[PDB]
Structure 1
Amino acid sequence: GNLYGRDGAAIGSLQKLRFFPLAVAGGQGARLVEEDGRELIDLSGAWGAASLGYGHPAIIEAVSRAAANPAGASILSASNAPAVALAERLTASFPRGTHKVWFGHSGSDANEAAYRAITRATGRTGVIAFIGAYHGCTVGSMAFSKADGLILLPYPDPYRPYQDDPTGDAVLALLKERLAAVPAGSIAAAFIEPIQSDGGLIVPPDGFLRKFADICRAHGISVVCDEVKVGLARSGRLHCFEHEGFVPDILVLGKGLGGGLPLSAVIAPAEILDCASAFAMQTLHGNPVCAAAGLAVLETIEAENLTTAAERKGKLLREGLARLAERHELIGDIRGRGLACGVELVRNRQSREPARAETAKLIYRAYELGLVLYYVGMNGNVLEMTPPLTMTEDEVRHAVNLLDQAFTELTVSDTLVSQFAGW
């Protein structure tokens, strides 16, 4: 039987998030190859995980090398050279002598470890996060995505401003209200995405995040910046907070850090990560195969000038999309930084009413045409584009061209679409 039907027979639905019957057998560059040999351009970049695309030589080199002479299998009960070299590279990239690293398998395990560490270091359980935030899918990362003392704030959206205040100041006022109503010093941490991912690739208003961080610092609250989606060159700066005029206390990394292998990291003050031992650990954490891949990703970002590539190619992509908006009225807003781009689809440009149903057919048709992308947003109406940082300019143009065909040929049965749960 076909690969997709074998996938239904053999793998439980528990971890599936399917939008169309993508059945992959290989990959090269920014393209996926299906079982039948059909190629698709991957604008999703595996939700951002395939930072160097598929079969990049630096990944091949590193993982093949480490597999043939691995420095053990772990950082728990052994130091290993690749893990320590990666830890030093990551701390050197982050504004010296103050921070250390913890390694994980995923953004979920990293946000969980950051939260457990700061609650253990401070003796406080309270936590600030945002409605619609995505910090992972484990009990400990879902606690704030519940924790006692959880404060959930609206994420300020330029396209849908809270209290009709485009600046986000009303959100800051709400925070101060929420903090005033609980004891001084009861809040351990604030988790923030510097571009809200599942919330709909929302770039906050100018100045908001720095003012938010200033409030947190006035209350002694650690500012944790989750850059699992938009970190490591994707935004057109190495770290996305570089666009925003603040430095967080803690940085969470994942997804594209591993280049297609499972790798996450927390960069945090030494006192936070040294407050306990044998406390947040999984046996394969810091294994040298995945550490080697991480080192390859950082080295490639430098060697291939991918921070600048992401900036340049993002501008190309957003320009392509604004040409599409001249003819496809469904496009309401085009936004993002670098190669993290969102395209919000609306039934009408004036009311901004979300276009959920059309977005799910759009991506299905795109898939039928040879282009992979997914949707996000509380209303299921934002196209997410996070392609491999190594996607060529011509591929960017082929993808916009296929998207133009999908907006035009918008054909997919309401029955065919209903076969996929998605979200």
Structure 2
Amino acid sequence: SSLPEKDIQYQLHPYTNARLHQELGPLIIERGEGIYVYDDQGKGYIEAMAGLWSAALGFSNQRLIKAAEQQFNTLPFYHLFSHKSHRPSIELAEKLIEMAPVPMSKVFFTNSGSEANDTVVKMVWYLNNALGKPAKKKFISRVNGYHGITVASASLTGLPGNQRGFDLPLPGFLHVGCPHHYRFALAGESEEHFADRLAVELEQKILAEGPETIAAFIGEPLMGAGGVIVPPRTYWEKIQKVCRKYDILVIADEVICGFGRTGQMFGSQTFGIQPDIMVLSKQLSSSYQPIAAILINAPVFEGIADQSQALGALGHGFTGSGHPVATAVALENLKIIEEESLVEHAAQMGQLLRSGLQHFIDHPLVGEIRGCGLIAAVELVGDRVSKAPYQALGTLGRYMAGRAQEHGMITRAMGDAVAFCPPLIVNEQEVGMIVERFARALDDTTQWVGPGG
């Protein structure tokens, strides 16, 4: 029995068509090194997505690996329940609070981003009950935002693909508009007037629902999985004014943006967000270990704290919350990012990536090139004037990603946009190779479509 046959027999794959997978089987990844991964046929790929927007230090950082070993051989598992604690969790939490872009009080650990946001939901409901505001429970998020896939976090998520067939969203989970100018501005509307209109939509939803009932607003500084959507200029400023105006919490989902992805350490810095709560994962540990972290500010903590006392204890926690190996790896991961000045380096590499892609700005199939820092996307279209897809929406993106893989590069399509989110350690010539391989895929795709003009 072959390894692909076993995979087809025994695994149900996430984000995969199960029937198609029975026919095609897997692409088996065997090993990784630097920014590369290699399949079981020996073929090498530049992992331009850093796996899942996550492997900041690439796929063979020995320091992370040794940090795991050292912790394993000390204390391979323990927990944080009932006052129990341990050094790595404590030192990681310290570090996270000291590097926070706004004053923060406490860290709560989970395994995943989905768990983290699911936990943030519970925390907010518990908070407002403590403050004697039992109706202030509803969450507002955006269309195409992604925040995980638990029943609750998938209700925060605004991608239909995460909701169809799952009876989601739940009640109490509301969605306002995707802040993507290219797709949702009115013709002749500026970015600033687009922002104004989005801020007005929000105020209108708050009033229509009853401000007293709205607990929180959650957003990725820029949207990752939904298309590498940069919000229009002034979006965050104006959205925050509306939130402060109705005493609504601002939650920044920094699962992707966190730790140098957007040109600064956090997307909250890059986009001037002053969040009450932040959510972190992915680059936190370069995904070498499953871990996520929630940062909460003083008011949120004090409320939760009072209530935990009134009720005996805080009735919430995962077995793996603050896992010593995962926290130890994350701690070392963050140190490395500081010591090797990878935020500033990622910013420089980002400028190269973007400049290199922009040689294609006038290509007949390129509708928009977007991004900031070391995250980017090229959205292809069949017609630039109408912005319509070639064939069905997603056809170009799917063909490109296929061709990129053929040319030794792994990118993810999101509809007809292809993303780039390489490891932070990518070097100058590697960025060139990424753009080259993008170009070869574009060329192939262009031959295939035959635009004329």
User: With structure 2 as the length reference, what TM-score do the two structures score?
Assistant: 0.85
* 218, 239, 243: which one aligns with 2:245: 218
Partner in structure 2 of residue 288 of structure 1: 324
The letter of the residue matching 2:302 is E
The letter of the residue matching 2:117 is N
Partner in structure 1 of residue 435 of structure 2: 400
CA contact 2:49–2:411 (8 Å) conserved in 1: yes
Question: Aligned with 2:32: secondary structure?
Answer: strand
Render the CA deviation track for 1:297-355: whole Å, top value 9, x for unaligned: 211110111111111001100111112345x4322211111111111111112211134
The CA distance in 2 between the partners of 1:301 and 1:74, in whole Å, is: 27
Render the CA deviation track for 1:13-55: whole Å, top value 9, x for unaligned: 4554789953100100000011121111000101212111111
What percentage of residue pairs aligned between the two structures are identical? 30
Partner in structure 2 of residue 386 of structure 1: 421
The CA distance in 1 between the partners of 2:115 and 2:325, in whole Å, is: 18
Partner in structure 2 of residue 235 of structure 1: 262
Question: Aligned with 2:68: secondary structure?
Answer: helix
Partner in structure 2 of residue 8 of structure 1: 8
Partner in structure 2 of residue 204 of structure 1: 231
Question: Aligned with 1:233: secondary structure?
Answer: coil
Question: Aligned with 1:358: secondary structure?
Answer: helix
CA contact 2:126–2:304 (8 Å) conserved in 1: no
Is the counterpart of residue 345 in structure 1 residue 380 in structure 2?
A: yes
CA contact 1:127–1:147 (8 Å) conserved in 2: no
Partner in structure 2 of residue 187 of structure 1: 214
CA contact 1:346–1:354 (8 Å) conserved in 2: yes
Partner in structure 2 of residue 83 of structure 1: 89
* Counterparts of residues 87-98 of structure 1 (less than 5 Å): 87-95=93-101, 98=104
CA contact 2:141–2:218 (8 Å) conserved in 1: yes
Distance 1:208-1:195 versus aligned 2 partners, 3 A rule: same
* 363, 369, 392: which one aligns with 2:407: 369
* Counterparts of residues 22-421 of structure 1 (less than 5 Å): 22-70=27-75, 72-77=77-82, 78-95=84-101, 98-123=104-129, 124-145=136-157, 146-164=169-187, 165=189, 166-167=191-192, 168-260=195-287, 261-269=289-297, 270-271=301-302, 273-274=304-305, 275-276=307-308, 277-326=313-362, 328-355=363-390, 356-376=394-414, 380-410=415-445
Q: How far is 1:375 from its partner?
A: 1.1
CA contact 1:257–1:297 (8 Å) conserved in 2: yes
Question: Aligned with 1:160: secondary structure?
Answer: helix
CA contact 1:375–1:381 (8 Å) conserved in 2: yes
For structure 1, the residue ranges without an aligned partner over 5 or more in a row are 415-423
The CA distance in 1 between the partners of 2:236 and 2:303, in whole Å, is: 22
For structure 2, the residue ranges without an aligned partner over 5 or more in a row are 130-135, 158-168
Q: Which has the higher contact order (CA 8 A, sep 6+)?
A: 1
Partner in structure 2 of residue 419 of structure 1: none
The CA distance in 1 between the partners of 2:314 and 2:8, in whole Å, is: 39
Render the CA deviation track for 1:208-230: whole Å, top value 9, x for unaligned: 11211111111111100001111
Distance 1:126-1:68 versus aligned 2 partners, 3 A rule: same
Distance 1:47-1:283 versus aligned 2 partners, 3 A rule: same
Question: Aligned with 1:198: secondary structure?
Answer: coil
CA contact 2:102–2:274 (8 Å) conserved in 1: no
CA contact 2:143–2:177 (8 Å) conserved in 1: yes
Question: Aligned with 2:376: secondary structure?
Answer: strand
User: With structure 1 as the length reference, what TM-score do the two structures score?
Assistant: 0.91
Question: Aligned with 1:224: secondary structure?
Answer: strand
The letter of the residue matching 1:59 is L
The CA distance in 2 between the partners of 1:101 and 1:84, in whole Å, is: 9
Question: Aligned with 2:182: secondary structure?
Answer: coil
Distance 1:279-1:38 versus aligned 2 partners, 3 A rule: same
Distance 1:98-1:361 versus aligned 2 partners, 3 A rule: closer
Q: How far is 1:207 from its partner?
A: 1.2
